[model samples]
Target: MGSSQPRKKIFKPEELRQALMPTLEALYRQDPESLPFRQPVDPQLLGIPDYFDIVKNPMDLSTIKRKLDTGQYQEPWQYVDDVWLMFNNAWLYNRKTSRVYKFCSKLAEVFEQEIDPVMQSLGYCCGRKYEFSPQTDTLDPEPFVDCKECGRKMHQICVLHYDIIWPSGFVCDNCLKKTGRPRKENKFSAKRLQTTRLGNHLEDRVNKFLRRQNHPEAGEVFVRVVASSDKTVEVKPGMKSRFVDSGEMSESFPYRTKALFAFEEIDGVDVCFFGMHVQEYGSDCPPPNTRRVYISYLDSIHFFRPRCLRTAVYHEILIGYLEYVKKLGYVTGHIWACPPSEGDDNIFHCHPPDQKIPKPKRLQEWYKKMLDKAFAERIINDYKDIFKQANEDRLTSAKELPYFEGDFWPNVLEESIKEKLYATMEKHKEVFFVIHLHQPPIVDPDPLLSCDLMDGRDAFLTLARDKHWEFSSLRRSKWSTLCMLVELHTQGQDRFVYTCNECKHHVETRWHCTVCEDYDLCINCHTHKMVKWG
Candidate 1:
């Protein structure tokens, strides 16, 4: 249909996008309809290998806006076609009765309602009107399942959306709140209490450490845990066996909990969370202690000020869990490091609950690099020893490794933490990790002493070898020089080191004040405050 009998075209493409901005914002970030249509889909990630084949003309709001800005959609109606195409793409490719279709259909109806007034206000001139009003019936589509708890037959989408576990035996969110996972949740809660159980006896040894020592940052650091898993922890309950199953796995992992480590002033709201869950004897687990544990997650660490002290907090709490299992006489405390999907991987962000995240070796390589630090921190023995190696080869697969949080909520947190630490060190090293080595007498393992930190110290806490090799052989930067210096002194023992704003311990090593004066952090003891990120 040909003619540009276009009445005087008054509105520019950019102007149309500007007028449309509010509705788009409301649909996007402002008001959340949970529409997954704001950005284009990632067929590769969504694993719909035939996706592009089905959606020959893919379209999305992001693409439409870009077209408007780049002058591709010079006329208003041309832009509108892409919006229609976008909705059509979703409706065709996704199942007629699925959440993806449900979401897109609603957005299609909303867009039809919102756009006409926008065009009229802009005085757009066009011969034909575009209408994309989806059928207005409320939905109750399938694969439907009944909640075993409340005994209501429900839509599968609602089941999945409302935090119900997989259908093996469903429990709806309404009943879940009314009647918590009392018996089931405590199984993990007990494990959590046991994890921090050492805090008592170990406290006397570290009585001074636990309490204040003119900590540069923390006025006091508290340690406790939540009965239920973290709001976003990966090892959550209600995970369906089908999602986790290579074969049929257990219907959800045992109750998981996060051992919260936070500073007192930052009270109630914690900073860093170490998520944990019980592990049965894997083929590799020693079974010396039939019970095993996994450090499934770590997160919400604040930036800048907490940056320097994270290592110490990580070590201290990690040590507590290790010893907690150690106290019960368990060995080979496990840690899994998962890399997260970067920006371009999924959609507006590439992610899916069960998305197959490609496992990269860089994480293993980093572990190799940090091998000494791991031993120095006392988490693992060198790989050469085989006592910890028995059922190890059998515990294969990252997902199968027991960190699986079930089928919802993609894992939230990871190891670039050390990478970030080094970056932070380079920038704020003068104030933070200035590792100038020194003397803390290395004591040998006291058979009576269970504290690994004390027991693991060598006859030499650290010794300056008589052979002084070239310092210049290592790169000349400060951290590099300090790395070489550690051979000559202790790994780290800074008197000036502040207590972690995160873990709240007197870190062997240790921000700035922005919104408040410097006094806010040490307002009580007269120390430091939050520094804006570099």
Candidate 2:
């Protein structure tokens, strides 16, 4: 291979000097105080000395170079002078290029060490002061303090720009606006509730209440409060075992309904109790078997007091818990009031159902209406002045309260079903086999699979056909010509063979749309909209 030839340099000495002169001149034109060097050298005076002519001024060159190298120069003009020398040497001594390269390297190091500090000190970085020197010598003076919120070192003038919490330390105006207050001394100041005694007492009360009600499994059931600062409470139903597991059934009714009292608290004190019941029934009995959930709240006035004996709290607690129970797939939720409080009596009067009261479809709305009515009759009537003044001030509106219909029992129940379906698929990696009867799939493939009911037989058929399923089998069974089969085994033996496409619940007899692929509707949805087969 031939050795590569060196490329010729482009600009001559005069051309290079002309190109660099404007930049150097502009640097010199900057404010003297703002310049990196305290004593900036005149840009016009900077130049490379010719070796032959330099004998006339050898002492001057030696003195300047020594001062530049040892950092004795007042300003960063020494580095600027080095840069000029490097460029000038590039033009003057092209053959000895190593001297020019060495000067350029030293120029960069000197600029970083000397020039950068000065530039930073002059508020050059991010429009903020970099140099922070607090004065300690002044008598009766306002001292510089670091903002507790933003950790910025601000002078006393900037500190007083906002309301200062002197005892807590100063907070920057921006942080004060953002957080609305000085940052807490300790962010993690929250203390968990020490409810060992209270929890034990509550458990005893619940067991006694259950025994009084003649509950056979009262001794096996226990109650405990799950307190949290979070407003929203989530309840995940147990799906590992069968919906109703098989065991020898006796007169005692082999079942345990453990009460879970979940509540939202503020500063270690209970504010709102969101409760639930985890009912486990013996497997021998088929599902749709009855399970009762006791509901009540803690006394609002005496919740913090010892014993806290009152049924008013229990009523409120029941209302909160009832909001979630039906959504959690419970058959029925019951509330039997303890004596002396008329909240339950008020509740019954508002919605007079028999002893077995089905869960309300819109429990939150119902609770609000019930509470508002009770408040109007009891509180407003007794304390007319307080409430009348509130109404006059527009604090209380007689117009319908801002009822969040979205948190209604039915909506939550539907959401819970969708959540469970998606959660099961995510956690168990279970493949939902769905059969599309239409020539082209009518329903979009939703990740939640709430819209499409998976076919159990076809699921096995696909698995068996692919030879991918561990327990794959084929069995011939009679099928209805018009209706498509859906096999959902989410709750094991209590599997749903036919589920309404709209509501996603089991139905023995359904209205089938023979023309529109795999469409099956429950009696409720079917009767509402009669299908026109074209």
Candidate 3:
């Protein structure tokens, strides 16, 4: 914060990471709402060879991490300059109004305001856009071993502690204990749909939790994950997507993960549930385009609700499922969005042979508005700004499925189920909806932590709590603080400032309608019909 230049100092094993962790976390968040600029831009994957031409030098968060990881930053000024340079490159390439540009601005702005002071006291920051060069003389390769069981990148000390240097290969303690669990035998048929045990275990848990909360149909009507590669999976059990069989799905277009939750009454009446499918694709890449063309897919979502439920069950499940995957450690991925077909639906709804339900009629317009709503709610970053990240950081696009393949930027062939949701048809109908891992799982032995049932309510709340913890600097606990934040935020009562636009009043508190937000009207005026309609 003082000199705007990092000074040379010896950082003991974790000190460098500790010193920079605050800055790293603040600027390089890998969540869906702020997806781009965390990693080095992929020109080949996004079809942007010209990016290299315009910006002769490029920098990104992950590259900084790599340099930090490798001890390439000999001076604090060098480290700080790299960060500044990364943002500068983004500003050079993208327009002022662009989302990526905004991300760079936000990161640089936040880094300057929040982390700058802490680093100054702790000692860190800038020599803005200083010429960057890798330290060739300071070359000392750091050891990193891949953990076979948990898929974590184990370090030298960790490797010795876990004894991953065995003659065979690397395995961690957690996974080693996991091997002791007995494996059950199951029958298999040609192209059989396999129900993973993870799904059943979670289904078992949530159904129980639902009963505690007094749900209508819990003991029987169920929810579970199903992302098996077996070919017999369907659009709906009896129903089929006409396009599924019509298209040529080669091995490259691998389906990654899929899950569905459906409920029923005593007499086999389908109540409500939600489901989604994920897939991956390829492009002009030679090898397994992991880093070259890093991408994943999620769409095929079916979210259904009824008159009885007060909350959006799928939203909870959606958040839960995503948190579980992130906990499971997928760094980045994408979601596809196409205008819902006529008579389309959410939940485990009716037979499509002659089924009908309300869906968006205008394709492009619907996509744009739905996107607009997400941006307002701050969920647009992870998915659309997707293809720009590294493959190592990517989980299956849903972060649900790992191997689903698809196309890169300005996505052609609409890899994500006719994606044209990004900007609009007038400019460019970007097919990508990116999602990256926001934060690692806060709790180690987390609730619903299994790959099977982890994407449920508990998982959602835990993730939300950690997010609130970051936003408010709130200490973590069982319930009280979280409850306070939830209650406060719900009615625009979060100990923050707000004013009614119509009456020109500055009352202490009022209901904040998300729909008629900043400019429209107060609750009384809108209810009394005294304000002009937009």
Show where candidate 1 strays beyond 4 Å: 1-215, 228-290, 304-306, 343-374, 377-534
Model 3 misplaced stretches (Cα beyond 4 Å): 1-198, 201-220, 225-227, 230-265, 268-273, 280-306, 343-431, 439-534
Error of 2 at 31 (Å): 80
Instruction: Output the number of the lDDT-best candidate.
Output: 3
Provide the lDDT at 311 for model 1: 42
TM-score of each: 0.28, 0.18, 0.28
Give per-residue CA lDDT, model 2, range 142-199, as digits (tens).
2345555444444443222222224555655555667786444321111121232324
Q: After superposition, how far is residue 135 of candidate 1 from its true place, in Å?
A: 26
Model 1: residue 287 alpha-carbon error in angstroms: 7.8
Q: Write the per-residue lDDT of candidate 3 for residues 1-534, one digit (tens) a residue.
A: 363313223455366666766677777563542467665789987888889889888887888888888878654545766877788788889999988787777777777775556544443222223221122122233244554544434333222321211445555544556677432221111012123343444445445545666755333434434322321112221111223353322123322334343332222222223345433221221123221112132222221222243223433334444444454444444444444455332222222233233343343343445444434554433344334433345543221222233233323223455334233322333443445434322221211112322222233335433332111111111112223223222322113345676687764455454543244455565453343332
Q: Once model 3 is optimally superposed onto the true structure by TM-score, how far is the C-alpha of residue 288 displaced, in angstroms?
A: 9.2
Error of model 2, residue 514, in angstroms: 49
- List the candidate 2 regions with Cα displacement exceeding 4 Å: 1-256, 259-292, 296-317, 340-534
- The TM-score that candidate 2 achieves is 0.18
For model 3, state the Cα shift of residue 162 in Å.
Answer: 55
